[PDB]
Design a protein around this ligand. Structure first.
Ligand code: HEC
Ligand code: HEC
Ligand code: HEC
Ligand code: HEC
Ligand code: HEC
Ligand code: HEC
Ligand code: FES
Ligand code: FES
Lengths: 181, 423, 235, 423, 235, 181
């Protein structure tokens, strides 16, 4: 029939066109060489605890910074109230409250948390690298792209950045190493 | 009326055997002897400027691509190979880089000339639509291009102006990864951008094809709210040689200034940090993407829930429309509303040379544009936040409400007849 | 006053003796830590800058570090066609190839090299391993010198580079007082060369083009005034 | 006669406000409802094939350029990155590489269809000129492209097909160096070729624009020496939907065969030596540039002063016209004479379906083309030299002398009237 | 007869046990001289070929040579993301990444590895340092074996590779007679994988496309026959 | 005047156009990094005289091959007659006849010529690399691109190649070295 045959030819043409177009939009996706996206062993190895440590991985920096007491007390003295993101973005644990006890890090295979904190050095606003070394209006990190003030533990404050600095999955290698991945 | 004067192919046997391919018929009848009014000021030249600048950019780019190597490890080195070894080098690069600046400067004057003399008003909607489409294409082009040197500003500008697409929910990260070729920026992004950057200009030329086809079928605006009175038209001298020569004179002046810049003030419009190689581990201060995107950058980074006029706290009614998404929508709307203008101005009138209130509001708009340009570079600390919010609010207010109210109560002026204004 | 250079203007094609002095300075002082990979050695014969004798260039090249190869791993003799070496880490600094553009540029280098005075009367102890500069602005500052909101009260900040020169570090063969200021000016000019070697050609092209385009524009103005005459005569 | 049937824009308000930009008027009146005769065989499809193949190549290339890195040290590696990691990879490359083969195969049938049915005869000269120009552009394109993989055949093909330009005296070495970017082949040549290779297709599209404009203004040739009898023309059905559907059916068949090849016989038309990296120090045996240049390669390497019909010993009268230059001129002339044809055939007649002697000579010409194709691959040792000389001589003889003699004494046939051939 | 492989046809998606056997041989025999830079180590888990266990892949990778770095010169752990090593010179051979396409391909490798017999009865002394192969055609030939015009009278020529395998060089874990012929076939298939890993996807795409396009073409033929009916009915 | 002014404006436009076009055609010329085009010291260093020696330089190979007596006698027994190119392309000397005495090479800083011959391994037809190791119909080199037969001393024979294999400027370094440039 007129209608059936004509419309079916059109439908088949459309289907073939789409099957040909999809790969032109698929090739731009991450290729297998980008699929890898594996782990990195960074050795703390006495870098003079308290200043900072940055390492490249996955194309983004991974901040490993020791703790300075003044920085710590400022951290532990932050009630969940008035905290933009209280989710403790760290993926090594559940959505537990963004508390310094949970938010600092594992305990060297020992029992302590207020001494090391390794987070992803990527601003949640649009992915810039905040400046460290005690900066901003909260004694933490400052993003120069739009002005987002981070705190000691990395929780976002005073800016458009919606959430704090995430924490990747990491465990220790018996007191001198870090496993990122 | 609309005298085409096809020339009847009566010249000679050469002009008679050309009845196989009409081409010269087209040129003569239409694109050279196109009746244009006499009342044209010096604001109707910038289209020739834009065409020439586009040709210039395309040429210089085709030349550079003979020495640029798209790769993270060999881009900077190739750029220096250009500026040092190649014979002309610095010239091509400075002419390419700065000419983009002139291109955008010229489109700004081309556009604001239009908003004044009702060039968006009917029956000239298609030209406006095509022009906004172009503007978009050329913005995207310049963005893809600022990345190729793989300096330091390249990386971070790309980072943020791609995190935008990721702000939106559900389909943000997917688009981000599909555009960057991966989670973050690397050589794949560079290849995409080079290809794309080496392809869109031709689309622009075609769109310029339709741009020129439209306003030849539709008469050039003229300083007044009047047409060429087709019904024989002592007004409306032709294009060649009069307006051709006028435009070429202005173009010579403009190129003179442009080359003076290129030769004495070439690194002025640039960012020095783009002369240091990239470090994905260290971000410089005041990225300041560029100067032809500061308006929208500011409209974006203005809405942050930091003012009593903060509509973000109200838009939070829906848990999905956060701040970032709100700013992105605000920018896209800042452009979409400029495109929608011709259906917002509810006036059966024309050029604001006979609409005073419109004059005042329009000069305020120009000032707002300049202010936004100056604010995108300054931090988000008080007082600049209030300034940016005010300016964006006025932009939207103009384009949404102001024009209807005028079209309602804005006719205290005697319109001029007889486009032959022998004053 | 501001100690303007020669090239600071519409003219000033890189007085070359200044650049030879800067080269004496750079290879004997700055090269110990810094490098200029983006700079081929053969450029020391190209016109515009130091038009040295090629043979001396080949000698000075062979007398430098060993750049191994690109095809067969083997420490070669480092022919001029290669680039200046690169000092990368372990107490070393960045590349000075284009540092004269990544900052009015050379004035930064002059007023930076110039200025390493002792620590001020806010933190005389200073810092261990870091030294003070009055113009570098991207360095750390002790908390004793910061104001109530993190801003520094010092003009400059603390830079990781030590003082590069003393009162009379090197001799000039041409005959000239080799104080610190003259050396700073000379090396600044040398770096500006290393960054913008094609400056003089830039200026000459600009002159030629300004002239030709002014001519063309004048002629077009006359043509316009003529064509538009019978329509702008009664008014 | 020539019914354009502009549609009068009477559809509705949408088709009436489109009086701002005519575009749909153009499409409908001209490029869709173009009266074409009924007498069309299956040889009038290959133009659609060529257009589709061109689009295909442009698309696949724009995709590849997102992963190809022009540099001697990273081209091969990038090609393998494509064929292994990328999602589609092998498909794009095989479709790009083989589609060139189909492109040239299709132009060959497009051209020889033309030589038979007097499509070069008046009043269709402009189409012929434009087609030869295109052929040249696309040959140069494919050449620039075979180089990009930086295999082994790439290098040496480039070497020789650039030494050609250097053969000529006085301005040979200068042109050679200005084209290679240096004395010999290196990355500079690669960058030039990539850019150029990524630019000419658009020029081809424009030229295709003029190609299509011409034969719409000038009626499509038809199997007969007759026109559409404009004066109403019961003959000459329209293009859409009839011939559109016919061409699409043939195109579906062709793509079916093409993809079967791509998926089962993809490396068949290629040279394995192009899968080993380049060594400027070692040349392989039987470079054999490609299969769409063997005719001219043979016409070139035939004249060597090794036959009693060797006109090189006679051309040596002038001490400047040596052998090499003679072969180069012979090739350029092999093409120039094909372009000059329409002014050599001195016949007031048309399609060789009514000219027997022409049929015989034409089939001999097709055989000569095939033979030249088969000979450019075989060494210059006896007897192949005599064969190549004979074939080139016949090519030139046909195109220079044979057509005049026919036009003189070649009308023993009853021409058909009434292009409505209801047999 | 010709000992056709599995993939030689419109089907034959790379029988994987054959490829695991070829891998056992390649890493223990051919790897001593040859390399496959164009081959990532992470492909030994991708479908189509040897779908080995990733952990074994990481182990085998760390057990290989040391590929230093691209950013900081330091001998790493040779992570799988890197590529197979490269043996370059001093008694070594070319890269086998795509040798299965630079020649019906794999049959060349089979009939090449197969065939190293003693020197014939024209030059039994042979050559010092070179060994004889039945099928290699790009090697030297002694003057004693050439004809009157330089052409060789031998089937093959002298190759610089020694005989790679004896009667029972290695054991197969699956359980199989590991004679020379089976090893040759297996390694040929492995190299064909290394060159064309996306073969099976090729064939499946070809099938799908042939089908869809045959359907489209049939429907278009019906549409054509219909439209052109009232004009081809009286004749 | 009408004529003068109009024509002068056109002339100035043309001049400016040409001054702008020339560099677009100049940039494609050899750049300064290609200008270098200097020398190379290849050490003969006992490579078993008689087979061959090839080295890369200027982007082309430089053939350094010792002499085999049979190859020599075939060379020295070639009268200038029936010799396509009798110019002795070697640029280390004048246009003296293409004779083996002049065409072989300098004499190690000693006195002998029939033992070494270093020429540019580039076919004069269109620049291909002939195959060495005693090949062709004259016991020399054979070009596979179009079939050009070279002789022992490198003089062209039996093919389209017009001239023999050139000889660059080279002198010896006291009995174990070669200077190319
Ligand atoms: C090691 C003993 C050095 C020698 C000798 C010189 N420089 Fe250097 N320089 C060095 C370091 C470690 C740094 C980094 C400083 C920091 O705090 O990051 C530098 C830096 C510079 C700079 C850049 C300053 C800036 O604003 O970033 C310049 C312009 C510079 N140095 C110049 C310079 C010159 C001209 C020298 C020779 C006279 C010289 N330096 C020597 C290490 C060392
Ligand atoms: C060194 C002891 C070797 C080992 C073990 C293997 N190969 Fe090899 N191979 C080697 C050399 C020096 C050469 C060059 C030979 C020449 O005359 O140029 C080769 C060559 C090959 C080739 C290419 C043959 C050709 O036609 O060019 C192949 C296909 C090949 N070799 C295969 C191969 C395999 C499968 C091996 C493991 C079973 C193997 N070779 C081991 C050196 C050495
Ligand atoms: C044929 C290629 C090509 C075309 C066409 C082209 N460019 Fe470019 N562009 C390049 C290359 C190559 C670079 C990198 C070299 C450089 O920066 O000068 C570049 C870089 C740029 C830069 C950064 C300049 C710098 O030095 O950082 C901008 C801005 C730019 N392009 C804008 C544009 C715009 C806008 C257009 C047209 C609408 C355009 N380009 C047309 C090739 C091209
Ligand atoms: C967003 C708006 C916009 C953009 C961007 C734009 N145009 Fe226009 N253009 C217009 C309008 C409106 C007119 C007035 C048409 C009329 O008067 O009929 C116009 C007119 C013109 C004219 C004829 C009269 C004049 O003003 O010179 C030319 C030529 C022209 N444009 C060229 C260009 C080129 C070339 C570009 C880009 C490379 C461009 N334009 C970009 C909207 C635009
Ligand atoms: C947008 C870019 C682009 C366009 C347009 C394009 N190609 Fe290519 N072409 C490439 C790239 C990239 C390569 C190298 C990768 C490859 O070989 O597949 C290439 C390679 C080739 C090759 C060698 C194929 C091989 O694998 O060795 C041929 C032949 C070729 N092109 C011909 C053409 C022809 C003919 C056209 C159109 C008339 C065309 N190309 C259009 C990008 C393009
Ligand atoms: C050297 C000659 C030549 C070349 C190459 C050539 N054409 Fe044609 N083309 C012709 C001639 C002659 C005709 C017949 C015109 C007529 O009958 O009025 C024609 C007709 C056509 C037609 C309409 C009738 C038909 O035969 O299908 C199309 C469509 C077409 N060409 C497209 C193309 C495209 C697309 C290309 C290249 C990408 C191309 N041609 C290359 C000479 C050429
Ligand atoms: S990107 Fe980090 S705050 Fe805007
Ligand atoms: S290129 Fe050497 S003979 Fe043709």
């Amino acid at each position: 029939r007129r209608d059936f045959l004509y419309h079916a030819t059109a439908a088949t043409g459309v289907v073939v066109t789409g099957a040909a177009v999809w790969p032109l939009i698929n090739q731009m996706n991450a290729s297998a060489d980008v699929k890898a996206m594996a782990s990195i062993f960074v050795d703390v190895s006495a870098v003079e605890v308290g200043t900072q440590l940055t390492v490249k991985w996955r194309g983004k920096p991974v901040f490993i910074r020791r703790r300075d007491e003044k920085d710590i007390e400022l951290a532990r003295s932050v009630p969940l109230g008035a905290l933009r993101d209280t989710s403790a973005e760290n993926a090594n644990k559940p959505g537990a409250e963004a508390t310094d006890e949970n938010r600092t890090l594992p305990a060297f295979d020992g029992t302590n948390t207020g001494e090391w904190l390794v987070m992803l050095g990527v601003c949640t606003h649009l992915g810039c690298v905040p400046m460290g070394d005690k900066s901003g209006d909260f004694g933490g990190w400052f993003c120069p792209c739009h002005g987002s003030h981070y705190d000691s533990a990395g929780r976002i404050r005073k800016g458009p950045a919606p959430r704090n600095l995430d924490i990747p999955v990491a465990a220790f290698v018996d007191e001198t190493t870090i496993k990122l991945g | 009326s609309g005298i085409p004067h096809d020339h009847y192919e009566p010249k000679t046997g050469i002009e008679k055997w050309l009845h196989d391919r009409l081409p010269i018929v087209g040129l003569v009848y239409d694109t050279i002897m196109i009746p244009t009014p006499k009342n044209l000021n010096w604001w109707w030249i910038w289209g020739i400027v834009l065409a020439f600048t586009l040709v210039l950019q395309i040429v210089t780019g085709i030349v550079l691509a003979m020495h640029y190597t798209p790769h993270v490890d060999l881009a900077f080195a190739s750029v220096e190979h250009i500026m040092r070894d190649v014979n002309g080098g610095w010239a091509m690069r400075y002419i390419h880089a700065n000419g983009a600046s002139l291109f955008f400067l010229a489109v700004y004057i081309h556009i604001f000339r239009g908003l004044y003399y009702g060039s968006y008003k009917a029956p000239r909607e298609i030209t406006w639509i095509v022009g906004m489409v172009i503007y978009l294409l050329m913005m995207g082009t310049a963005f893809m291009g600022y990345v190729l040197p793989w300096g330091q500003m390249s990386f971070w500008g790309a980072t943020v102006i791609t995190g935008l697409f990721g702000a939106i929910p559900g389909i943000g990260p997917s688009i981000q990864a599909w555009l960057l070729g991966g989670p973050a920026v690397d050589n794949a992004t560079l290849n995409r951008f080079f290809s794309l950057h080496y392809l869109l200009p031709f689309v622009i030329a075609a769109l310029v094809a339709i741009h020129i086809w439209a306003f030849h079928t539709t008469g050039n605006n003229n300083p007044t709210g009047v047409e060429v009175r087709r019904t024989a038209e002592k007004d409306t001298l032709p294009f060649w040689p009069y307006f051709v020569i006028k435009d070429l004179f202005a173009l010579a002046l403009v190129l003179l200034g442009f080359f003076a810049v290129v030769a004495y003030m070439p690194n002025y419009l640039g960012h020095p940090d783009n002369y240091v190689q990239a470090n994905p581990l260290s971000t410089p201060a005041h990225i300041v993407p560029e100067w032809y995107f500061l308006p929208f950058y500011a409209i974006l980074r203005a809405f942050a829930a930091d003012v009593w006029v903060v509509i973000l706290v109200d838009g939070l009614t829906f848990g999905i429309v956060d701040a970032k998404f709100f700013g992105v929508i605000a920018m896209f709307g800042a452009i979409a509303v400029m495109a929608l203008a011709p259906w917002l101005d509810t006036s059966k009138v024309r050029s604001g040379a006979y609409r005073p209130k419109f004059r005042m509001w329009f000069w305020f708009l120009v000032l707002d544009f300049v202010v936004l340009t100056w604010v995108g570079a300054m931090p988000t600390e008080y007082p600049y936040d209030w300034i940016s919010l005010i300016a964006s609010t006025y932009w939207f207010a103009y384009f949404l409400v102001i024009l209807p109210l005028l079209g309602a109560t804005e006719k205290p002026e005697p319109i001029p007849a007889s486009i032959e204004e022998d004053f | 006053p501001d100690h303007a250079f020669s090239f600071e203007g519409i003219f000033g094609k890189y007085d070359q003796a200044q650049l030879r002095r800067g080269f004496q300075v750079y290879n004997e002082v700055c090269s110990a830590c810094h490098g200029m990979k983006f700079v081929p050695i053969r450029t020391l014969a190209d016109d515009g800058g130091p038009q040295l004798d090629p043979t001396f260039v080949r000698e000075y090249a062979a007398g430098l570090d060993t750049i191994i190869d690109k095809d067969s791993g083997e420490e070669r003799d480092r022919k001029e066609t290669d680039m200046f070496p690169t000092r990368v880490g372990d107490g070393m600094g960045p590349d000075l190839s284009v540092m004269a553009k990544a900052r009015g540029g050379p004035e930064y280098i002059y007023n930076y090299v110039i200025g390493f005075e002792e620590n001020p009367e806010c933190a005389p102890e200073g810092i261990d391993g870091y030294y003070y500069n009055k113009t570098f602005q991207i360095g750390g500052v002790p908390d004793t010198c910061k104001d109530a909101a993190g801003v520094k009260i010092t003009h400059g900040s603390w830079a990781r580079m030590p003082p590069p020169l003393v009162d009379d570090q090197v001799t000039y063969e041409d005959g000239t007082p080799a104080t610190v200021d003259q050396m700073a000016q000379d090396v600044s000019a040398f770096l500006m060369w290393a960054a913008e070697p094609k400056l003089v050609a830039r200026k000459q092209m600009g002159l030629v083009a300004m002239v030709m385009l002014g001519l063309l524009s004048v002629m077009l103005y006359l043509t316009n005034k003529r064509l538009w005459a019978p329509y702008k005569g009664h008014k």
